[PDB]
Amino acid sequence: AEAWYNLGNAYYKQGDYDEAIEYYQKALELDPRSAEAWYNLGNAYYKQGDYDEAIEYYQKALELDPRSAEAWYNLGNAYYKQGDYDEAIEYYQKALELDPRSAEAWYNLGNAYYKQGDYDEAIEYYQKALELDPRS
Ligand SMILES: [Ca+2]
Ligand SMILES: [Ca+2]
Ligand SMILES: [Ca+2]
Ligand SMILES: [Ca+2]
Ligand SMILES: [Ca+2]
Ligand SMILES: [Ca+2]
Ligand SMILES: [Cl-]
Ligand SMILES: [Cl-]
């Protein structure tokens, strides 16, 4: 499974998402408990704009590794990119329970509230992001 997974990664890194998906699928045929292969399959679908499918595969990754702050964050992002800002908030909150020093997750939580039209909440979360990283 590891060799097919790393072949998929190399294709992913050169932007060949169709081939990455094929080889991640082969990895998952050999090891259906690879949280890494489920996550990277979700990422390849995310890169193609296929958020519905990305969410299915992130959910599988989270069944195997529920302490994946990464999967929770990208699951949030897959809803955010669709305009599903209240779903995004739930998964950014879960990412931040696991990694409360993630300036990225706080910032994106603020962005979701901004997009919901709650500017006072956006301000709180942006202030938290800027406390952790005042450079952007
Ligand atoms: Ca669909
Ligand atoms: Ca849909
Ligand atoms: Ca489809
Ligand atoms: Ca983890
Ligand atoms: Ca949609
Ligand atoms: Ca909504
Ligand atoms: Cl769906
Ligand atoms: Cl929908």
Where b means 16+ CB within 10 Å and e means fewer, 65-77 reads beebbbbbbbbbb
User: What distance in angstroms lies between residue 103's CA and the mean position of ligand 2's atoms?
Assistant: 29
How close is the Cα of 82 to the center of ligand 2, in Å? 8
1-66: which CATH topology?
1.25.40
Residue 56 C-alpha to ligand 5 middle, in angstroms? 13
Q: Which residue has the tokens 């603020």?
A: 110
From the list 47, 42, 13, 10, the residue with the least C-alpha distance to 28 is 42
- Say how many Å lie between the CA of residue 127 and the centre of ligand 3: 39
Per the listing, tokens 């706080």 go with 106
Nearest Cα residue to 104 out of 126, 78, 81: 126
Task: Give the ligand with the smallest distance to the CA of 78.
Answer: 5
Resolution in A: 1.4
CA of 58 relative to ligand 1 center, distance in Å = 15
Collapsed DSSP state (helix, strand, coil) of residue 11 = helix
Find the helix or strand (DSSP H, E) in which 121 lies. helix 119-132
Which three-class secondary structure string do you get for 69-90? Answer: HHHHHHHHHHHHCCCCHHHHHH
Name the closest ligand to CA 115.
Answer: 6
The CATH classification number of 83-136 equals: 1.25.40.10
> What is the C-alpha to C-alpha distance for residues 84 and 63, in angstroms, rounded to an integer?
22
Q: Hey, where are the domains in the chain?
A: 1-66, 83-136
Cα 121 from Cα 114, distance rounded (Å): 8
Q: Check if the beta carbon of residue 8 is closer than 8 Å to that of residue 37.
A: yes
